[PDB]
Design a protein around this ligand. Structure first.
Ligand SMILES: C[C@@H]1CCC[C@@H](C[C@H]2Cc3cc(O)cc(O)c3C(=O)O2)O1
Ligand SMILES: C[C@@H]1CCC[C@@H](C[C@H]2Cc3cc(O)cc(O)c3C(=O)O2)O1
Ligand SMILES: N[C@@H](CCCC[NH3+])C(=O)O
Ligand SMILES: N[C@@H](CCCC[NH3+])C(=O)O
Ligand SMILES: [Cl-]
Ligand SMILES: [Cl-]
Ligand SMILES: [Cl-]
Ligand SMILES: [Cl-]
Ligand SMILES: [Cl-]
Lengths: 472, 476
């Protein structure tokens, strides 16, 4: 046992003493000639007890175990890029003209970043190793590191160094985003950037963040979505367009909500809801196979089968069906509002404030549909116009829209529709752009963080964001 | 020849009349079988007709002409390309509507679907033409507020934003080929560091908390180096709550990377490789022309062939002003001296006149416009300007820093990172989370920032940042 403060204070005095004796504990440059992954790839085939003594290399990394088998034989584990080798430092092999062996190695502690000049071999036990001639401290770790709560979210660097799975999680994340980018680019889509701060915040229903620009003396809204300006680009003649990036919604933090999250929205001119469904099934099934070489995955446990096609459940037909009720249109008539309210009560669930037709329908949809399936993803489709102000009216079903929303394990990860392009039907900047002619178009949104949760077996969004937002 | 409101209001009545006569003017779906680029590629080689092929094609009408009632000529555009629609009474399927009625209805800007056959006279010959989405206004500062108009009317506008995405694509593949790992860091933090700039503030309601939009990505990326991600980067927006002018937009796109075990010399090689390769990739040459002073007056050449000149900020200021600037730079004798030089040359005195801002001002007057024919680096900036850069390995008072300039504008800032936590407190309000991460061991590291919008300005021949942002931030 050691007191952390003593540890820290002592390592601090050590640093100052090195400085004072003229040794620079933070040297500027150490020219490494090979990485640890490279080193392993290149020498893993060596024979037990075989040294290549005439092959000198410079290698770096973080010391993670310190050991000894006497004062003239020190062992360390050295990690870089998520791989590990042994450092076997033997007194006889040490270049004594550069410091007392014992001084130079007593000072090396767990967490230290080091540079090593030495030669590759395997120990007789077969352990792939570097045998120093010289070991340089490049950057000390001044605190004792954990061997094994909230710290993983506040000190993500600690998490990344100690837990192999943490690194796997964020690697998978970037892979997911890479796949998506190439998937859209293969299909002729054009990546763009739209503003994060606008005079209005539209394209979804969510409270916004507000901020103030000093030069223009103006209160701007951080964006809750990217829909409106992307559509303006369709009008502008960019027929396949998308954006991957953050959006901001000013509401509660939970296991599936972070106030900044990463979305992808695309707009596809001359497509419609049917094209969007096909796209969703292709994307998800191909994404999953690309990561796992199979369509069925384990999640915390339950199997999720991503083999297309997926079930499509019509929001009205299904609510009515599981509640032996008819919901007469208009959906915001008093008779249908009262009725919807009755169901809420009849089933003792939380009444939304205020109880508008759109929010009641939404609430009924979360209770009676959204957890219909767990074995596969599925779509809820054909949402009422009152919920869907920017979706186009259904081509055979008055009151409804050509909309879909994909769910995985009761959580929405996708929202898409045929875009309303008739400016007259919309009144009930962007609006001006519609008057110039928005071609028939299909639009689609993904929630990236939520997708990554499922494909890395996490059940908090916090586990797939490097630095999630938290109370200090 | 027409009032815009009449035009608009009339096209509106037309839309309603179509609806009332049972025609849906905004059909849900027209299944096209070929795009315009595809169409061109496939039939460029056809003076002849091929009635041996019936196709469905879409696009926006952009010119309407005629040579008789029975002979109508349109330009149709999609994905940057254009073909002719030659609509001839002969070829029209009269079992689907009066030829003259249909085609009198079609105006400039209309989005249409066409069923016809390919030929040259390079054209599509309709048997039938469907309206898919009308343009209710006659088509021609507006370029910034209605960027859709700009994208449709000016070929160069589309070139500009295509080039922009290409630039970002090249950069992404350039870092990925070299083993770099893309990540996302937060846009809203409890403090905003990594640069000197006023921040935007916003408030989260459920946690009842004030947060700062990020002015840079430096600190959290460095925390990822500590975490063992030795090559890391982020491309994305940052926010600085400052003035707006030809080279400043309050949100702009940057790229920052951190390269463990590299230093300032690695960063210079990287900069030269990146820029020269980027330019050749776009133009098949290293020398490009740029209308600094506007398309009105004469352009200049910019030669991106490496290597680029490196000018040491202290050496050069002293040299062009016959002065010695004794360290410390924030002593009174050296502040007063710097002031007197600003006074003797009638340049604007910064408020307050700190050592760092005076040095900065002297650097913008006497160095930053040294070259115009090539990019160049200003290097080895004083510590007082550079609170996160590491101290120079042989030059007291200075740091291992570089800034690249193109035509007098900074596009790159990079350095060997200060990784000694004891020296940093002394340099520094900035993060304790960050400061704590340093104590766990930041390896020797090189960091670099690019200003993407400003790079794109130079490589698309624009001299306002507003020309390379789709929707720049403006007053209503
Ligand atoms: C833009 C996407 C398209 C798919 C449907 C939803 C999913 C989105 C909802 C959401 C809301 C929120 O307040 C905080 C979040 O973190 C998330 C999220 O992670 O996922 O929005
Ligand atoms: C992160 C980069 C590294 C290179 C140096 C600067 C360039 C950056 C500075 C700037 C500041 C600003 O308030 C508004 C801007 O638009 C820009 C810009 O576009 O250029 O920052
Ligand atoms: N803006 C939508 C995503 C696209 C919906 C289809 N246009 C949302 O945030 O849910
Ligand atoms: N954060 C710097 C970019 C360079 C980073 C070098 N450590 C800036 O905003 O200007
Ligand atoms: Cl249908
Ligand atoms: Cl939700
Ligand atoms: Cl390297
Ligand atoms: Cl050097
Ligand atoms: Cl600047």
């Amino acid at each position: 046992e050691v007191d952390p403060r003593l540890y820290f204070e002592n390592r601090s005095k050590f640093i100052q003493d090195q400085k004072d004796k003229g040794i620079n504990p933070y040297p500027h440059k150490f020219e490494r000639t090979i990485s640890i992954p490279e080193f392993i790839e290149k020498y893993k085939d060596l024979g037990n007890g075989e040294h290549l003594e005439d092959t000198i290399l410079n290698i770096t990394g973080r010391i993670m175990r310190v050991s000894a088998s006497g004062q003239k034989l020190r062992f360390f584990d050295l990690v870089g890029d998520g791989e590990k080798i042994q450092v076997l430092a033997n007194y006889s092999f040490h270049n004594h003209e550069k410091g007392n062996f014992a001084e130079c190695y007593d000072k090396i502690r767990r967490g230290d970043i080091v540079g090593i000049v030495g030669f590759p071999g395997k120990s007789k036990k077969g352990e792939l190793s570097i045998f120093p001639k010289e070991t340089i401290l490049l950057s000390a770790c001044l605190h004792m590191l954990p061997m094994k709560t909230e710290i993983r979210y506040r000190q993500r660097y600690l998490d990344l160094l100690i837990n192999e799975s943490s690194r796997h999680t964020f690697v998978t994340r970037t892979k997911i985003i890479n796949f998506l980018r190439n998937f859209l680019n293969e299909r002729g889509f054009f990546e763009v950037e739209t503003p994060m701060m606008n005079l209005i915040a539209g394209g979804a229903n969510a409270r916004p963040f507000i901020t103030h620009h000093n030069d223009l003396d103006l209160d701007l809204y951080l964006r809750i979505a990217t829909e409106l300006p992307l559509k303006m680009l369709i009008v502008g003649g960019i027929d396949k367009v998308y954006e991957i990036g953050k959006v901001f919604r000013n509401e509660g933090i939970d296991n599936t909500h972070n106030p900044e999250f990463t979305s992808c929205e695309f707009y596809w001119a001359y497509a419609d809801y049917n094209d969007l469904i096909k796209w969703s099934e292709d994307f998800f099934s191909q994404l999953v196979y690309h990561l796992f070489g199979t369509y069925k995955i384990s999640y915390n446990p339950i199997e999720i089968d991503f083999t297309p096609p997926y079930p499509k459940v019509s929001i009205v037909e299904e609510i009515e069906k599981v509640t032996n009720t008819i919901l007469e249109q208009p959906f915001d008539s008093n008779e249908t509002i009262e009725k919807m309210i009755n169901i809420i009560k009849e089933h003792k669930i939380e009444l939304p404030n205020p109880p508008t037709a759109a929010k009641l329908l939404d609430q009924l949809a979360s209770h009676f549909i959204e957890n219909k399936y767990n074995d596969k993803p599925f779509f809820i489709v054909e949402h009422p116009q009152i919920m869907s102000p920017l979706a186009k009216y259904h081509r055979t079903k008055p009151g409804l829209t050509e909309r879909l929303e994909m769910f995985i394990c009761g959580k929405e990860v996708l929202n898409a529709y045929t875009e309303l392009n008739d400016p007259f039907k919309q009144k009930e900047a962007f609006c001006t752009s519609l008057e110039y002619g928005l071609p028939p178009t299909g639009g689609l949104g993904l929630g990236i963080d939520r997708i990554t949760m499922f494909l890395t077996n996490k059940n908090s969004i916090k586990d797939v964001i490097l630095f999630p937002t938290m109370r200090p």
